[PDB]
Curated annotation (Swiss-Prot):
EC number(s) from the headed UniProt entry: 4.2.2.n1
Gene3D superfamilies (alphabetical): 1.10.530.10, Periplasmic binding protein-like II (3.40.190.10)
Keywords tagged on the record: Cell outer membrane, Cell wall biogenesis/degradation, Lyase, Membrane, Signal
Protein name: Membrane-bound lytic murein transglycosylase F
Length: 428
């Protein structure tokens, strides 16, 4: 009989079951994203087969699907292995360490120890490792009460805390970090238990043909830095923006963006460009404040110079609609003017750089990249060269000389993150 691996390669498809969530697998008109999605995609390519994603509405369903005849090959869904073996499931090597965290609402008193969880309105996901943590705690503290939901995602639990529907939830640290940017009142109470490793799940039994390939792959994904890069993209908001930066973004998302969203959407439509990228530029530039000023000659929501404003037909840089229109028009123009050899998505990152530093200085960075034997059409290569424009050792011999290329790298990295964050917004 064919092995699990032989079946996948025979069918030419790897079926992977996950959850429908930005953290794992997420559909947007532009495409598909997610930590587990990207990892599974790379694994499918390693096997030389197509990736077919399936989703489950809760963990019980996910595990039921995995154990059914004709079920998927594996589950990739930020799964924490149970503390005892069950014949129905086998786990891969772990690929990410996460810390369970009790989450509370700023404005209420912070529980500091497990004992403080008694007398609280608590909700967690049914079938989760977090539910088992509370079940175990309840044996020690019988008065402990908590509820389990089998019909929501982690984003929904955190929303419940944020708006005061519940007092506390318990989630993995990476999910908190990913969602802190949406919920301004959510705070970590304390770390509950030691760090746990996430793992992919495979069906039960003695067939190790696919498992050995999974573990070989995860080892390689770690070595090549893939796991780190994915971790930083999806789960790195607090690491990069800072904790205060993250919940402050949440506040601004809630209070400021609604005043200007319609403008960004209108500009995006008439310019045929993703409005969330425009909004992301707006946040990096002014934190969505149309009255924002500077001492460097830029002003307004999109931080336009007088020269750019004039060129774009902006008569009032302090008018949010005008600033958004002009700034968006300028970004699209810049992007259109880039050398044809620069393809999307890199093309958009180059355009962000040019928005910040100008096309002339950017071209110097591209020429430096080529000279160093790097690809001048790949953003990640040119990004290495930009900071050198700030150092006389390098810029003195460039055509256009000194430029703050370090700030440009920061600008693009931040805008790309804000862009991700806005794309991953989900509705209540
Ligand atoms: Cl970047
Ligand atoms: Mg659902
Ligand atoms: Mg065996």
């Amino acid at each position: 009989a064919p092995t699990a691996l032989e079946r996948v390669q025979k069918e030419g498809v790897l079926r992977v079951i996950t959850r429908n969530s930005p953290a794992t697998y997420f559909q947007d008109r532009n495409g598909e994203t997610g930590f587990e999605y990207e990892l599974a995609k790379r694994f499918a390519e390693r096997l030389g087969v197509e990736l077919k994603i399936e989703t489950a509405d809760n963990l019980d369903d996910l595990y039921a699907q995995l154990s059914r005849e004709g079920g998927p090959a594996l589950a990739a869904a930020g799964l924490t292995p149970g503390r005892e073996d069950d014949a129905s499931v086998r786990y891969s090597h772990t690929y990410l360490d996460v810390t369970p965290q009790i989450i509370y609402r700023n404005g209420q008193q912070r529980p500091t120890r497990p004992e403080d969880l008694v007398g609280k309105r608590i909700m967690v996901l049914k079938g989760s490792s977090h539910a088992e943590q509370l079940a175990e705690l309840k044996k020690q503290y019988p008065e402990l009460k908590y509820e389990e939901s089998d019909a929501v995602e982690v984003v929904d639990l955190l929303r419940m805390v944020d708006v005061g529907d519940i007092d506390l939830t318990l989630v993995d640290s990476n999910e908190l970090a990913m969602n802190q940017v949406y919920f301004p009142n959510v705070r970590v109470a304390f770390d509950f238990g030691e760090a746990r490793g996430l793992a992919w799940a495979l069906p039960g039994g003695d067939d190790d043909s696919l498992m050995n390939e999974v573990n070989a792959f995860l080892d390689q994904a770690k070595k090549e830095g893939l796991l780190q890069r994915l971790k930083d993209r999806y789960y790195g908001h607090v690491d990069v923006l800072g904790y205060v930066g993250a919940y402050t973004f949440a506040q601004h998302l809630q209070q400021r963006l609604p005043r200007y969203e319609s403008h960004f959407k209108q500009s995006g439509k008439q310019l045929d460009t993703d409005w969330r990228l425009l909004a992301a530029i707006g946040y990096q530039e002014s934190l969505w404040q149309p009255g924002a000023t500077s001492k460097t000659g830029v002003r307004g929501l999109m931080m336009l110079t007088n020269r750019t404003a004039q060129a774009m037909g902006v008569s009032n840089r302090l008018d949010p609609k005008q600033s958004i229109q002009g700034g968006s028009k300028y970004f699209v123009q810049i992007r259109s003017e880039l050398p044809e050899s620069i393809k999307e998505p890199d093309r958009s990152w180059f355009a962000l750089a040019a928005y910040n530093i100008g096309g002339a200085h950017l071209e110097d960075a591209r020429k430096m990249a080529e000279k160093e034997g790097l690809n001048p059409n790949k953003w990640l290569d040119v990004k290495k060269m930009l900071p050198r424009l700030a150092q006389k050792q390098w810029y003195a011999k460039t055509r256009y000389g000194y430029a703050r290329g370090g700030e440009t790298v920061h600008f693009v990295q931040n805008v790309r993150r804000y862009y991700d964050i806005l794309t991953w917004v989900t509705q209540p």
